Symmetry: C4
Subunit: 354 residues, 4 copies
């Protein structure tokens, strides 16, 4: 027979990709009440966070105020690189002056990125994130390897982003201290549409973990998360931390401009590959928009960790390491409709559901 989906090559369509809305965690036998769950997890090989959450390296999400707030809440911020090197380094210093808090900073690849990285290290950064649209190439692997060789002793080096097992494996071989996963799932991202390229985020995590976990390298699940439950799903798929843009962009600490329209409150949120971000040869792979204002970061993080704690209680996971062993059930569109509230008019805002 021909392949059921066309042509004669069984490997042309190589797998079925799932994302967060395709799966649910199965409850299991539990001696863990949400209050007693330990939410700590490895950000990188050497760095463990109290709360397994980091803020996106975006000019509408993370600058010093967000980095400070995230660290105090037990996570970490990654300072964006859409600003001069001296300014990014200064923001690292600001976070460092606020109580020796952990902080990360994004860099690109090449000579200017090298100088940026060295200035960030001098400023006391804890984590360098080599942050690129496509990490599966010699330029990114060389950057990760060279950084580890030169400053690896004082700084952890993260590489990303990937969406496959082989790209995750290449980053592991280059010496990455963590691997960041996500090609296209971002709320403001058009990569999958403009280039046609990506992998659904749950499958991308499962695949990257298949390479990283046996090598003891933590995986950061970056993009596509919209609810506390999605964080539990990402970790159960094998990630060690989750990176958030949209969920944090509406908070007081995000550096986006505060917007008032139709008697409502918003903040700007835009892709770093949007036309506006690139200006402030490649065609854009993001859009510019706004998200509703969500109040203080601390309260958002509390709701997110609370949802994670519930998941740990339901699945009998005393630690994140046990949560990573939980099982999924795949669901249909009807299952998804059933999972959200349905057939009711919401009359009151919930702090963890809008």
């Amino acid at each position: 027979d021909p392949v059921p989906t066309g042509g004669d090559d069984p490997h042309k369509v190589a797998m079925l990709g799932l994302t967060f809305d395709d799966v649910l965690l199965l409850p299991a036998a539990s001696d863990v009440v949400p209050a007693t769950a330990d939410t700590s997890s490895q950000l990188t090989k050497k760095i463990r966070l109290k709360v397994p959450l980091v803020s996106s390296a975006m000019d509408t999400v993370t600058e010093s105020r967000m980095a400070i707030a995230m660290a105090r809440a037990g996570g970490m911020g990654v300072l964006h690189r859409n600003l001069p090197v001296a300014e990014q380094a200064g923001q690292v210093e600001m976070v460092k002056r606020s109580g020796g808090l952990l902080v990360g900073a994004a860099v690109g690849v090449g000579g200017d990125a090298w100088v940026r990285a060295m200035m960030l290290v001098d400023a006391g950064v804890d984590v360098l994130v080599v942050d690129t649209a496509h990490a599966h190439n010699r330029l990114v692997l060389d950057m990760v390897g060279k950084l580890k060789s030169e400053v690896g002793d004082r700084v952890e080096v993260v590489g990303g982003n990937v969406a496959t097992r082989s790209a995750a494996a290449a980053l592991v071989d280059a010496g990455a201290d963590a691997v960041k996963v996500g090609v296209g799932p971002g709320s403001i991202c058009t990569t999958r549409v403009v280039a046609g390229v990506g992998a659904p985020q749950i499958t991308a995590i499962l695949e990257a973990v298949a390479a990283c976990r046996p090598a003891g390298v933590p995986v950061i699940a970056d993009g596509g998360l919209q609810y506390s439950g999605d964080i539990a799903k990402a970790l159960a798929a094998g990630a060690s931390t989750a990176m958030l843009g949209s969920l944090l962009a509406g908070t007081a600490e995000a550096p986006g401009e505060l917007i008032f329209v139709n008697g409502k409150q918003y903040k700007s949120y835009r892709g770093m590959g949007s036309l506006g971000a690139m200006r402030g040869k490649l065609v854009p792979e993001g859009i510019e928009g706004r998200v509703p204002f969500r109040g203080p970061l601390s309260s958002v993080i509390h709701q997110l960790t609370g949802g994670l704690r519930a998941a740990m209680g339901y699945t009998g996971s005393p630690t994140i390491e046990v949560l990573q062993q939980a099982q999924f059930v795949r669901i249909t569109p009807a299952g998804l409709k059933e999972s959200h509230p349905h057939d009711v008019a919401m009359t009151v805002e919930a702090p963890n559901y809008y």
Copy 2:
């Protein structure tokens, strides 16, 4: 090969979960006209109802008036536990003073729940429902077992909620007289979203029944039901009764406040894990809302049992026990669209379809 959905573990995504909108009952050879169908079914091992329906233990669904009405209609109510012990016990007495009608009452786990249970038994309750978000743990199993040991002679003890075969089996082993199934399907429930945890309700029923039916323990299908046909589906999947919140919350007998907006009529309906219910450490797993007013309970129950009777006629099921042996066909989104009315503007309200 890697698993088609990612990673190398075939059991990571353990099954495909179906819910009501994913399946239809197949018609079969029949000598049963709807009028002659026997809708009676076991609520628990010792208690058989004339109509296999019970009202949810929620502060917007079941208080004494609902409990009285449900019992008179041939089902039963489960009195909610969001009120002082003396008041819940008093409501049991009110139902009991109205003609020796059957009544159930929810309790939690722990010392206060124990005192509540003893007061309810003293008041003459027929069924205690140990009613928890997650029953697969020693606390709930111990509560069920201790209740059966102490008052098991005069009261039936139900345990819930579960969504897996193993959790249903644990409750059976603890001595449960029925097992209640449903993690996340409720109309006002956000568990699946906030915690990421659950199982689509048809599969959850099939799995629980695989453990309960061979032990002679009835399964209560709790949550997610929106039409009379869904009740037939739940029973065919193997449940013995169905528990309803949304479908009954809009009735005259529900204790929710009656609301007038936009020239229309509603009643409040809220999750017992909503912020408003919890107040009146855990983050909410429900929302607060309203549902349209549906009139007297009796008329709603008549329409629901009528739909069930039709299903029994179509499937050749003279009893609920035979309905539990019916077969399903799985359907696609197109099948679902075809099942509901389509391509027509409804001009008149139907008593059993809105």
Copy 3:
């Protein structure tokens, strides 16, 4: 392993049901241009129609004017039975007085239905349709068998409706001259929702045909059709004719009341199991509504047969009998979106697409 969808019984969920929007006909080698296609097909064992279309036996679709128009267009009407026996018989006579045109009439089961049938035969009806919600029972089979024994010589006897192979086989064994398929697909039908019972219409046809075709008994595909392409699909699945309600209810010849609202034109269309039809013990299994006015029947039939002719050209089918051998490809929701016009604002009405 447990069954992937739950429980331990592989046959509990017995198959995957497809309907019209799930499939497309594959083009094939062709020496048939649409103009040369022969659209004739068996309505029953003895009766062949020029156009393989019949109008539904509904009080908002078929009375004498529709029956006359359908016959003149090369199809047939089935006169509804929601009126006194003498009136239904009179309408048969009216059609018969209009040029010896073919006509059918619906009857139920039991004594009154028997008298109705005899009066219809006396009036010259060509086809009796034993027309019931569920045909898989002794009452319907006996009616079909008795009618064939008593008047089978002068009248063709159709039985319906079924949605399974075994029910189709029972009707064949009872002596049915055609078998009508459709449990729940109707536009105004709530059977699948109220009772939870049915089978998606393409699979229902495939299954019924598996029983009827080897016995030389034509299958009438009844309900769910919305476009000319759906007719081609039904016939390719193995049906010999298609029965239409919605598509014909908006025509001038339908007996529904003509409605003017919002500067637009509609006609009433209602299920025969709607509360309004039943009045003019069972709960309703239909709704009451309206459909847009579509003009003269002849023009609608021309567009429908034109679409069928195109399908025959694409599939290389010179006759309906060859069309019944065509192949399908199954499609996804994306495939369905692609099939309809997309990403364009329609500015002009098309005669065969709204």
Copy 4:
């Protein structure tokens, strides 16, 4: 067992058809930055384009201005045939007078189409496109074969449209220099709805390529494309070029009338099988509408090629021939929702996403 979808014939439903929104390209190891990608590709056996894009032969898409613009941008236009032969030939001459640019022209089948073809060849056309709704028949195959025999030396001859392996193979055997694929995917097309016939476009490409690629015959993927990413998908499925209607109809160079409604700007765009096009025996297989105005063609083509270049960078494809070897992952509806921007209000127009 019966076939899981109904009946006893395993080949009745022959395969599962995918289209663009069902798949994503997997990133791969890459030494190709978008800037260095070579986007050139074969239009036909003898003609290679700098940009693998051609404009649809439609009266609202391609006349001389569009043909000139496409050629200058490195693609080609196919002049439509809904106008007198002398006028179509004149437009060929106009394009030819503008710098020896490449140009194609559509013809039908039969005597008038033959005269049209000869006049187009005399006028200097580079490519004749035998352009029919259904190419799998002797009339079209004879036309292709006769054209190749008579003028094959000076002109390339394309045949279409097909949606199957066997029809593609027949065109290859007839001597086609390229095969054009697409039955029903067009934005303005109702073929799949009116006739019920077609195949989802990715599967159609895979199937046609299975016949054409081993014979060295390029495949033109015609219809259904809405984003730059879709072009990358079509080429990865094995096509050598993509034909665009909707994406180009809104450009300044399209010959559609410019429309002003609601303070917005549109241009007319209609199917060539719409009632309006056919007039200016068959029932229509297209609709008439409008699309938003998109500005100069050059800027649209730049955005489209930019997206393609990104895909080549992500997949490590230095040439289109390597892109044709890329792998897909199949996605679910959740995956598709995740791929587009989600959970954000777009506040600024993006040049490559609306």
